[PDB]
């Protein structure tokens with residue numbers, strides 16, 4: 566899965 | 579003679595794959611007579627070569643500020659590799675050396691808990707929303723707040739405080755107009771840290 | 787030559803009538819060849835004579851540490867009187883002077899709120915209890931915890947943080963076994979600040 570912060574990409578594992 | 583200071587990247591930059599982390603070796607008191615400054619950079623003792631010098635900056639007190647900057651890989655920094663800047667200059671009988679890296683220690687996951695205003699606060703024009711963050715290590719962390727996609731800028735976060743079990747905690751407090759809280763608006767505490775899944779978590783909060 | 791550092795009393799001392807606040811003039815890097823230090827104290831430019839010198843103490847990097855300590859009245863410190871320590875030593879081209887006093891500005895009363903642990907927090911051996919202290923000025927304060935007339939020692943308190951309206955806030959965190967909490971015990975956050983009624987308030991928290 567992937568995580569975004571205010572639209573911006575944080576990280577994907 | 580010249581003095582040397584070496585700064586880490588910013589937590590957010592090391593945690594967001596969409597951002598570019600860098601370490602910064604700043605040399606001050608560089609004299610008008612020997613302004614030449616050599617930089618050697620090492621990553622775990624192995625000399626890298628991709629650093630860049632920033633524009634020379636003359637200081638109001640007759641000295642130069644000379645700054646080399648090294649870009650770094652997210653996983654290297656977070657693997658806790660050691661970064662060394664070595665500075666040579668003619669006014670400096672011996673090269674100066676500095677190292678930083680991530681604080682060592684098993685990394686621990688922040689536990690993120692939100693707390694609504696006290697009934698005793700409900701008498702006031704604004705109320706406080708708290709985001710308690712505890713049990714995290716290292717102390718490198720980003721906390722921010724938001725509502726409906728949009729950032730809220732009216733918050734303050736405490737510096738990280740060392741706890742009795744060897745991990746850290748802090749609180750972030752966002753102050754908002756009572757009416758905004760009564761209006762049923764969801765508020766969200768976003769926390770970024772290397773020991774979280776995808777380096778990011780988000781906890782929410784609103785009237786019951 | 788010598789360097790000087792002038793320290794304020796502890797917040798708690800100035801707030802309790804029972805304790806004795808003091809201001810403290812430290813002199814470091816006094817030399818072996820000239821260990822004599824002359825202290826002059828002034829309160830609002832008016833010299834006083836009642837300070838006392840602590841025993842001289844050798845530092846082991848070839849210098850002495852020389853402390854003069856001045857007792858102060860609670861109302862005086864709180865009313866924002868300025869304390870001045872003038873230090874003279876033969877190594878000093880001119881006497882060093884330092885001043886300290888309470889932060890200037892309208893004192894403001896802390897708003898004290900206790901916050902229970904989250905229903906998400908509740909699957910651990912211990913729980914966290916919060917005491918949010920906001921809206922106080924100056925930042926001089928003391929926070930302690932108690933339960934049923936006994937001190938609760940397992941807490942940490944953040945440093946005071948400057949807020950956008952120019953007052954401060956902090957949070958104090960008490961950690962207690964989940965059981966002690968579930969069983970309806972009452973825990974108290976106690977706050978001491980110059981702008982509280984009787985410089986003291988207590989708020990409590992229970993399931």
Ligand SMILES: *[C@@H]1O[C@H](CO[C@@H]2O[C@@H](C)[C@@H](O)[C@@H](O)[C@@H]2O)[C@@H](O[C@@H]2O[C@H](CO)[C@@H](O[C@@H]3O[C@H](CO[C@H]4O[C@H](CO)[C@@H](O)[C@H](O)[C@@H]4O[C@@H]4O[C@H](CO)[C@@H](O[C@@H]5O[C@H](CO)[C@H](O)[C@H](O)[C@H]5O)[C@H](O)[C@H]4NC(C)=O)[C@@H](O)[C@H](O[C@H]4O[C@H](CO)[C@@H](O)[C@H](O)[C@@H]4O)[C@@H]3O)[C@H](O)[C@H]2NC(C)=O)[C@H](O)[C@H]1NC(C)=O
Pocket residue numbers: 581583585586587588591599600601602604606607637638639641643
């Ligand atoms: C002649 O003048 C110069 C310049 O002086 C400046 O201008 C004058 C007019 C005055 O206003 C000064 O106050 C100005 O500073 C003098 O140079 C100064 O020398 C000082 C020591 O002699 C030195 O002190 C050391 O500072 C460290 C912290 O510095 C931070 O923060 C300060 C302010 O808080 C800031 O001014 C500094 O520039 C420095 O800023 C950081 O820069 C880094 C690198 O750019 C940033 O990190 C990067 O950021 C980018 C994005 O921008 C990206 O995210 C990268 O990934 C990241 O790496 C970082 O964000 C900046 N921080 C901030 C807050 O802005 C102290 O830590 C250090 O103390 C430590 O060491 C001491 C032991 O020596 C201990 O006492 C102490 O405990 C600490 O361990 C030093 O005190 C000043 O910084 C320096 N000023 C500048 C601008 O470099 C010079 O001394 C004077 N000559 C003579 C002969 O007197």
Ligand SMILES: *[C@@H]1O[C@H](CO[C@@H]2O[C@@H](C)[C@@H](O)[C@@H](O)[C@@H]2O)[C@@H](O[C@@H]2O[C@H](CO)[C@@H](O[C@@H]3O[C@H](CO[C@H]4O[C@H](CO)[C@@H](O)[C@H](O)[C@@H]4O[C@@H]4O[C@H](CO)[C@@H](O[C@@H]5O[C@H](CO)[C@H](O)[C@H](O)[C@H]5O)[C@H](O)[C@H]4NC(C)=O)[C@@H](O)[C@H](O[C@H]4O[C@H](CO)[C@@H](O)[C@H](O)[C@@H]4O)[C@@H]3O)[C@H](O)[C@H]2NC(C)=O)[C@H](O)[C@H]1NC(C)=O
Pocket residue numbers: 789791793794795796807808809810812814815845846847849851
């Ligand atoms: C020879 O050695 C000596 C001693 O060194 C010690 O011994 C050796 C073995 C080493 O291990 C050292 O680590 C030891 O310190 C050297 O002395 C040092 O000189 C420094 C100057 O270069 C000086 O730095 C300044 O210190 C200020 C903070 O000092 C606090 O906190 C430190 C450490 O955190 C502590 O060590 C000091 O004692 C002092 O502690 C406070 O003492 C006061 C007075 O007693 C207490 O207040 C009173 O408490 C009583 C009851 O107890 C009552 O409540 C009273 O009402 C109350 O007044 C208070 O509780 C103590 N506080 C704490 C937290 O413990 C800094 O603020 C200061 O910085 C400021 O100024 C700078 C500009 O000059 C700025 O850069 C800076 O940003 C600030 O503006 C300095 O850092 C050290 O204090 C001093 N150490 C001691 C013990 O005196 C000496 O230099 C060396 N000589 C040579 C040639 O090398």
